[PDB]
Amino acid sequence: ASEAKQTVHTGNTVLLMIKGKPVGRAQSASGQREYGTTGVYEIGSIMPQEHVYLRYEGTITVERLRMKKE
Amino acid sequence: ASEAKQTVHTGNTVLLMIKGKPVGRAQSASGQREYGTTGVYEIGSIMPQEHVYLRYEGTITVERLRMKKE
């Protein structure tokens, strides 16, 4: 039995590709992402009035076993 | 302590108003005041005999985040 209504990605389900070649023996990939969300405050209340996005940042980290070639 | 019970004013306990409308996004206000207080000296003592007020001056500075309107 194979159902689509629930499914999760897994290490076996996902290829990593660079320039149209799959990366062999990749052990992990970690993608991280940040928007710099800054809260707006003013005289008259302690509450945040608003949030603003100010600076996008992100990194991709890859661990791999060192092959003898490629 | 409850806001109704604090002994000290704090930024949330006060509002800034001009022409009967609250000034939004107010970050700070600084009020300064000078009296020109000058000491009088005379021959026979090294010490000021009295101080006198000469010229009142004062400035109020307001700083805000710039809104898209108002």
d(CA A43, CA A51): 16
Q: How far is the first Cα of chain A from the last one, in angstroms, to the nearest whole number?
A: 38
In Å, how far is A58's CA from the nearest CA of chain B? 28
User: Which residues on chain A are in Cβ contact (under 8 Å) with B65?
Assistant: 40, 42
CB–CB of B4/B35 below 8 Å?
A: no
CB–CB of B35/A62 below 8 Å?
A: no
User: Which residues on chain B are in Cβ contact (under 8 Å) with A46?
Assistant: 12
d(CA B24, CA A59): 38
Number of C-beta neighbours around residue A42 at 10 A = 22
- Which residues on chain A place their C-beta less than 8 Å from a C-beta of chain B? 40, 42-46, 49
Q: Which two tokens stand for residue B50?
A: 């009295």
In Å, how far is A43's CA from the nearest CA of chain B? 5
Residue of A65, A38, A69, A42 lying closest to A51 (CA atoms): A38
d(CA A30, CA A32): 7
Data resolution in angstroms: 3.6
Burial of residue A47 (number of CB atoms within 10 Å: 0-12, 13-18, 19+): exposed
CB neighbour list of residue B69: distance below 8 Å, 6 or more residues apart: none
Burial of residue B47 (number of CB atoms within 10 Å: 0-12, 13-18, 19+): exposed
In Å, how far is A57's CA from the nearest CA of chain B? 24
CB–CB of A40/A9 below 8 Å?
A: no
Which of A40, A44, A49 is nearest residue B12 as measured by Cβ atoms? A44
The DSSP secondary-structure symbol of A11 reads: T
